[PDB]
Design an enzyme around this catalytic site. Structure first.
Site, PDB file in Angstrom:
ATOM      1  N   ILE A  37       0.845  -1.189   0.000  1.00 18.42           N
ATOM      2  CA  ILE A  37       0.000   0.000   0.000  1.00 18.42           C
ATOM      3  C   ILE A  37       0.882   1.241   0.000  1.00 18.42           C
ATOM      4  O   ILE A  37       1.757   1.393   0.862  1.00 18.42           O
ATOM      5  CB  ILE A  37      -0.951  -0.002   1.209  1.00 18.42           C
ATOM      6  N   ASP A  38       0.651   2.128  -0.965  1.00 17.01           N
ATOM      7  CA  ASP A  38       1.389   3.379  -1.036  1.00 17.01           C
ATOM      8  C   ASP A  38       0.857   4.372  -0.004  1.00 17.01           C
ATOM      9  O   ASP A  38      -0.217   4.194   0.577  1.00 17.01           O
ATOM     10  CB  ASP A  38       1.292   3.976  -2.441  1.00 17.01           C
ATOM     11  N   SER A  39       1.636   5.434   0.223  1.00 20.29           N
ATOM     12  CA  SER A  39       1.225   6.466   1.171  1.00 20.29           C
ATOM     13  C   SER A  39      -0.076   7.129   0.736  1.00 20.29           C
ATOM     14  O   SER A  39      -0.937   7.430   1.572  1.00 20.29           O
ATOM     15  CB  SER A  39       2.331   7.508   1.325  1.00 20.29           C
ATOM     16  N   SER A  41      -2.556   5.804  -0.891  1.00 26.20           N
ATOM     17  CA  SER A  41      -3.651   4.912  -0.527  1.00 26.20           C
ATOM     18  C   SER A  41      -3.955   4.994   0.963  1.00 26.20           C
ATOM     19  O   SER A  41      -5.124   4.990   1.367  1.00 26.20           O
ATOM     20  CB  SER A  41      -3.315   3.475  -0.929  1.00 26.20           C
ATOM     21  N   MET A  42      -2.914   5.069   1.796  1.00 25.87           N
ATOM     22  CA  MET A  42      -3.122   5.199   3.235  1.00 25.87           C
ATOM     23  C   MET A  42      -3.847   6.498   3.571  1.00 25.87           C
ATOM     24  O   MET A  42      -4.667   6.538   4.495  1.00 25.87           O
ATOM     25  CB  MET A  42      -1.783   5.130   3.967  1.00 25.87           C
TER      26      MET A  42
END
Ligand SMILES: CC(C)(COP(=O)(O)O)[C@@H](O)C(=O)NCCC(=O)NCCS
Lengths: 82, 81, 192, 255, 51
Positions: A37-39, A41-42
């Site tokens: 999960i990329d930043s 997406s977070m």
């Protein structure tokens, strides 16, 4: 609330953002490679959590959080911070 | 509790399609094509209020030569004078 | 003087056409959306797109090709760009109202995903359609198509994608004024 | 001086007649007749648009076809969209020509060419919205029955409003002193109305019927748009930064 | 008079198809429960010829 309940809500949110199964998401799993999960997406996860459960996570804290349990612990800390 | 309008477009879908095809068929057969009709209805680009168009027409009216506002020129370009 | 008469007529008509078009689009969007500000944002965002669109077409023909834009091109392109631009914003805005129920912030994300490449595909096709006019031997017809085609690319990729969602985020409840809409619903408890 | 005014069809005939005799004569060797005028230039201007109108129609379709293939990733689905476009164009061409034949309103080359392209493009966009929403319902898991109702519920009014906006905008073109702009608002306004009526009647009817015959209107990609999720997220949390980028792009055109 | 005389001399006027009408049975059902929908379709057909 309970750690398991926080995960259940977050795992549901994670599924909407990317598609990771709620059962797959565990507190041990990390957003780095375990969840892939990329930043960005977070960030969306925090936005959905804020508009659903009222939990506000600033982007500074988003970088600090590493695994699901870390997110839950901080979120559960916010529950403590009444 | 389906809405009437989409339902009417579904239960009676087949006749609705036929009607549009029938309507289009009449339009092309009765009236010539757009290009043919469009050329007939070509309106003048010169406005009525335009003084320049009126001025040229006014000259013809007084001089009793014409009443139009459009004139053409025929150039007899030759190799020699 | 006839060209001046064409010029004077065009100058008056362009102002009248622009004002009349904006007012009618304002009311139509206001009626459907039932929000004064929301209609204003939709109309306002489109006008910005045309300003950027106008320069690109002038650059394309007057500067790059070198053939100046025809005087009739601008009045024709204004209405078409305004008409199509308002539609794409309306599609997103109407979807936003259908998604604003579960939080303004979350609702915007759903609307973008709900109408993503769908509007983009439609937006691209319309632009191509307008560009396909250029094939006309008459440059005047060609210039009209290119000017409208370029605007649709800007409207679909900039105003719809970036400008429109950003404004609604800032306004929040004011974006849907006078209709009363909550910024976010009641926070929920974590399910079992 | 010849009969008719510049732009009028009679002037085109007058230019044709004068040039006909000028061409059909025994010009001396070297000497050649050259008929030229403002009316002659405008008269031949009409012909170019009308003559190239056939080529414009052919190119427009070719572009849309290819585009439809890539978006839907299905040959069968592409033909369905094209079918509605042809019907929309046919109705638009007919009624505009139908009323013009009875001298209801005038028609110019600019008006005729714009009527054709606009109708084709508008029709294509309306079809995409209906089908795009329909495939979205299918991806949501709705059956072929409930998807149709959901599609029409969430798109018909939007398409209706969008069509009136286009028709309303063309109506304002009528209120112009110049003849070409004034004589173009009526043909465009009527033409758009036909497409909206056709798209909201022939559209749903076709979608209702075709979906029943096998796997035709069901999507095939079943894939999200990773870009859009990233684009939307930035606007939600940082709208000002995104807005500035939008503002910057507008300023570029102003140069 | 013709019908009365012929009918008594052999199985002449007795029906040979002996089949019900499936086309008319279904149409009558539609025209009763949804009169407005059927009427609108009927009206449209009349307006077509007016062009
Ligand atoms: C999220 C972030 C700002 C920071 O990411 P990092 O902390 O993983 O470097 C950046 O990497 C990012 O946006 N990544 C996603 C790519 C994208 O298209 N973002 C669009 C939002 S502007």
């Amino acid at each position: 609330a309970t750690q398991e309940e926080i995960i259940a809500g977050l795992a549901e949110i994670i599924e909407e953002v990317t598609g990771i199964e709620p059962s797959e998401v565990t507190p041990e799993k990390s957003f780095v490679d375990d969840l892939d999960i990329d930043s960005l997406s977070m960030v969306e996860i925090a936005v959905q959590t804020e508009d659903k459960y009222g939990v506000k996570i600033p982007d500074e804290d988003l970088a600090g959080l590493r695994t699901v349990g870390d997110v839950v612990a901080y979120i559960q800390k916010l529950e403590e911070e009444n | 509790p389906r809405p009437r309008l989409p339902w009417f477009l579904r239960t009676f879908a087949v006749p609705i399609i036929l009607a549009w095809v029938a309507v289009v068929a009449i339009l092309n057969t009765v009236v010539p094509t757009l290009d043919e009709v469009g050329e007939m209805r070509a309106v003048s680009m010169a406005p009525n209020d335009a003084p320049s168009t009126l001025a040229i027409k006014r000259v013809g009216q007084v001089f009793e030569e014409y009443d139009t506002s459009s004139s053409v020129m025929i150039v007899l370009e030759g190799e020699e004078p | 003087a006839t060209y001046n008469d064409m010029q004077i007529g065009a100058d008056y008509d362009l102002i009248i056409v622009a004002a009349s078009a904006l007012i009618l689009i304002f009311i139509i969007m206001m009626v459907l959306t039932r929000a004064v500000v929301a209609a204003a944002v939709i109309v306002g965002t489109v006008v910005l797109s045309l300003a950027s669109a106008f320069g690109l077409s002038v650059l394309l023909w007057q500067h790059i090709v070198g053939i100046p834009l025809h005087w009739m091109v601008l009045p024709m392109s204004v209405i078409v760009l305004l008409a199509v631009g308002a539609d794409y914003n309306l599609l997103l805005v109407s979807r936003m109202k259908e998604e604003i129920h579960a939080g303004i912030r979350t609702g915007i994300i759903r609307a973008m995903v709900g109408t993503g490449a769908v509007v983009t595909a439609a937006g691209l096709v319309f632009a191509f359609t307008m560009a396909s006019m250029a094939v006309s031997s008459l440059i005047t017809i060609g210039q009209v198509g290119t000017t409208i085609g370029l605007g649709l690319l800007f409207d679909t990729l900039v105003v719809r994608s970036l400008m429109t969602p950003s404004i609604a985020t800032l306004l929040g409840r004011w974006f849907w004024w006078p209709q009363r809409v909550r910024e976010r619903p009641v926070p929920s408890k974590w399910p079992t | 001086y010849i009969a008719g005014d510049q732009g009028e069809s009679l002037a085109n005939e007058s230019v044709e007649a004068v040039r006909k005799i000028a061409t059909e004569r025994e010009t001396p060797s070297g000497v050649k007749a050259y008929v030229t005028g403002a009316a002659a230039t405008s008269a031949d201007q009409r012909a170019e648009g009308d003559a190239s109108m056939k080529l414009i129609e052919g190119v427009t379709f070719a572009v849309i076809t290819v585009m439809l293939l890539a978006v839907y990733r299905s040959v069968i689905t592409t033909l369905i969209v094209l079918a509605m476009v042809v019907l929309g164009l046919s109705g638009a061409r007919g009624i505009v020509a139908f009323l013009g034949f009875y001298n209801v309103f005038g028609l110019t080359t600019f008006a005729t060419n714009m009527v054709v392209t606009l109708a084709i493009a508008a029709a294509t966009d309306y079809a995409i919205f209906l089908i795009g929403r329909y495939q979205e319902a299918r991806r949501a898991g709705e059956d072929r029955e409930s998807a149709y109702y959901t599609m029409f519920h969430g798109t018909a009014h939007v398409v209706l409003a969008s069509g009136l906006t286009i028709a309303g905008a063309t109506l304002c073109l009528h209120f112009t002193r110049l003849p070409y702009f004034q004589t173009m608002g009526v043909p465009l306004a009527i033409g758009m109305l036909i497409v909206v009526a056709a798209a909201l009647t022939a559209g749903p009817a076709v979608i209702s019927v075709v979906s029943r015959f096998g796997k035709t209107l069901e999507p095939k990609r079943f894939s999200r748009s990773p870009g859009w999720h990233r684009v939307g997220t930035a606007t939600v949390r940082w709208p000002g930064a995104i807005l500035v980028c939008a503002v910057v792009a507008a300023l570029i055109g102003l140069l």
